[PDB]
């Protein structure tokens, strides 16, 4: 039902969903934000910036479309969303606004504002954006030295020396087609699609990206920009995670549902079936925390990030999710890994089906970029209630027993012990 | 419990130090790295540039007591042999 054809050059995938409205074709390619070196970082949001500038939205909208996109660590996607009688219009004005000839968004006058917006909106990002900040922190990090260790957005040092030289040559090196895959979502059928692809003629280029010569490897490390001005203290710390296409990705992903998500002062979120809440809720150690497991295409991360009003007690925080992080391997029961299957089949089936067409198309097109082509809800079903609580066991000794983590913070931190502390208190001595 | 007076060290979290804001500190895990780095480069120069800095604040004052000490050995030697008899009962009275 998720079908895939390969055409001349570029792949086409798309899912046709009849009951819904807005049809969405766009173009997902698989160079994003760890395909550069830290020099010209940052140029992958300069090109959605000038994809969704005011030329090009203003355009776009007088024939009733709507722009979208979303850089990611790997996949960077183009988006044009549209009504469902109405997405012939949607390509060629994708192939005649961003396939071919971009002379009209690439000149000094809507590329210098662009990059002045782009410019004030990182800055407020980084002052006044705190979890996010800290995740790509520990991204950076983590990997560091090594490509997937770059903002996403891109850093207010190398954003200032960045001209249409640049994205010239990001577009010569990177918009390929052997690179790209184009996608559709909502209500379009699977061969009026490539019908109108392959009618007009739509190819961006012939060659193929540059390989990278450092893979992603995991470096065990700590950071902490510590501000006493911020009223709270938001840390993170993870191990290295499976990666997409690996065998262990959904037992990472129920291992993280295990833990679940927590909001302090819901009355919903604090009656869950986690042991931790027996522990973080007499003292209030915590507002939230959500565990995570970010899968890209080298490796991935895994683990929790916080905020913290009470900065004294940071430490007993980090120690006691840390123990239950080792009763994984020790001494995991199996209602826990029930509710999590349960839990994670609906937090799978809340992200592929939703009522938005283009969050569908960017997963879509990251998951036919990296794997070829789609498996379905239910595959991702059968494989999640095939898991025992000894595979659970076996990932986690595999992963998290004694690995080595890293850690980023912000905030009031000096409750926070520092790191060979919290380096060997991922492993007890048996109680 | 009685909260007594206050001092100039608290605890972790409120340390009682001034504010401090844009100071980053990275850190990589032992595991990571390897120790006894540069044992032999620092066993040579480091020492012999901490040995150069600070010897002559060691050895100047003990080379006076050494020299008044050995001195006055020498001259207690002398005085208690034959040839300094008259110079005993001198120096006694
Ligand atoms: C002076 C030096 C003081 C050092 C204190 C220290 O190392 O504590 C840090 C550390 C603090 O851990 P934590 O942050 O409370 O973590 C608690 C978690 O449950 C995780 O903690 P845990 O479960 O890993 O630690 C529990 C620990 C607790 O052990 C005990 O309290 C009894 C030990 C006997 O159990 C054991 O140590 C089992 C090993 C027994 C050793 C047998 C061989 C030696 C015979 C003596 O505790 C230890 O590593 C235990 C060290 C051994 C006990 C001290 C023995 C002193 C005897 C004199
Ligand atoms: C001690 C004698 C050292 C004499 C001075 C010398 O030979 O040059 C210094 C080297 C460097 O040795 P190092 O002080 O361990 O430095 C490690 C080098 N890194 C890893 C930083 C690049 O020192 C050496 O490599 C000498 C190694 C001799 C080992 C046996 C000593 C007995
Ligand atoms: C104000 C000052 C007053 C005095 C203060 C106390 C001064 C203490 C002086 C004496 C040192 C006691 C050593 C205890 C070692 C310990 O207990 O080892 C606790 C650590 C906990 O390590 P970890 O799990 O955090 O990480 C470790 C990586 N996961 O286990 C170890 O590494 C085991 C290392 C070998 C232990 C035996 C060493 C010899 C001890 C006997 C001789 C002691 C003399
Ligand atoms: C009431 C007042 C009475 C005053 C009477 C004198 C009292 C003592 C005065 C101070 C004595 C020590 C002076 C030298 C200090 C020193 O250790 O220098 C040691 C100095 C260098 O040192 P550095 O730090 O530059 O090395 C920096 C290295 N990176 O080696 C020398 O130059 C060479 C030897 C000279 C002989």
């Known amino acids: 039902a998720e079908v895939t054809q390969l055409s001349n050059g570029i792949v086409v995938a798309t899912e046709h969903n009849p009951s819904a409205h807005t049809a969405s074709v766009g173009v997902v390619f698989g160079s994003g934000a760890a395909n550069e070196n830290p020099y010209n970082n940052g140029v992958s949001n300069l090109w959605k910036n000038i994809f969704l500038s005011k030329e090009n939205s203003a355009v776009a909208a007088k024939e009733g479309l709507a722009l979208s996109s979303n850089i990611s660590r790997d996949f960077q996607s183009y988006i044009v969303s549209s009504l469902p009688g109405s997405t012939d219009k949607s390509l060629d004005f994708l192939n005649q606004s961003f396939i ?13 504002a662009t990059k002045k917006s782009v410019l004030k909106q990182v800055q407020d990002f980084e002052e006044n954006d705190h979890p996010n900040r800290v995740l790509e922190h520990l991204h950076s990090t983590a990997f560091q030295n090594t490509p997937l260790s770059l903002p996403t957005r891109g850093t207010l ?5 960045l001209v249409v030289a640049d994205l010239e040559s990001f577009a010569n090196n990177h918009f390929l087609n052997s690179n790209a895959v184009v996608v559709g979502t909502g209500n379009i059928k699977h061969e009026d699609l490539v019908n109108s692809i392959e009618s007009k003629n739509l190819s961006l280029q012939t060659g193929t990206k540059p390989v990278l010569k450092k893979k992603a490897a995991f470096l065990g490390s700590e950071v902490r920009l510590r501000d006493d001005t911020l009223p709270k203290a938001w840390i993170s710390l993870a191990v290295e995670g499976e990666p997409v296409n690996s065998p262990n990705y959904f037992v990472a992903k129920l291992a993280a549902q295990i833990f679940g998500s927590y909001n302090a002062f819901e009355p919903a979120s604090r009656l869950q079936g986690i042991k931790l809440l027996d522990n973080i809720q007499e003292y209030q150690l915590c507002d939230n925390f959500n565990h995570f497991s970010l899968s890209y295409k080298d490796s991935g991360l895994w683990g929790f990030s916080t905020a913290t009003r009470n900065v004294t007690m940071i430490d007993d925080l980090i120690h006691f999710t840390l123990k239950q992080w080792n009763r994984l391997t020790i001494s995991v029961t199996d209602t826990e890994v029930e509710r999590a299957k349960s839990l994670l089949k609906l937090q799978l089936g809340q992200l592929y089906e939703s009522g938005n067409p283009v969050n569908d198309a960017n997963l879509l097109g990251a998951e036919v970029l990296i794997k070829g082509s789609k498996l379905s809800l239910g595959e991702a079903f059968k494989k999640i209630d095939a ?15 004694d690995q080595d983590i890293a850690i980023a913070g912000t905030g009031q931190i000096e409750g926070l012990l520092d790191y060979m502390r919290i ?5 007890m001595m048996r109680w | 419990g009685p909260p007594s007076g206050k001092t100039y060290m608290g605890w972790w979290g409120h340390m009682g130090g001034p504010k401090q804001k844009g100071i980053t500190s990275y850190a990589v895990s032992p595991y990571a790295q390897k120790p006894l780095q540069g044992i032999f480069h620092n066993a040579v120069f480091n020492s012999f540039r901490r040995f150069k800095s600070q010897f002559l604040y060691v050895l100047i004052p003990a080379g006076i007591y050494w020299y008044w000490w050995k001195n006055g050995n020498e001259y207690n030697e002398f005085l208690y042999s034959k040839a300094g008899r008259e110079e005993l009962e001198r120096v006694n009275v």
């Open chain 1, 157 to 161: 040092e190398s954003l200032e020396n």
């Open chain 1, 100 to 112: 071919q000839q971009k002379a009209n968004l690439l000149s000094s006058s809507n590329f210098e």
């Open chain 1, 387 to 401: 898991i025992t609580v000894k595979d659970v066991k076996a990932w986690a000794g595999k992963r998290l027993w």
């Open chain 1, 423 to 427: 380096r060997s208190d991922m492993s």
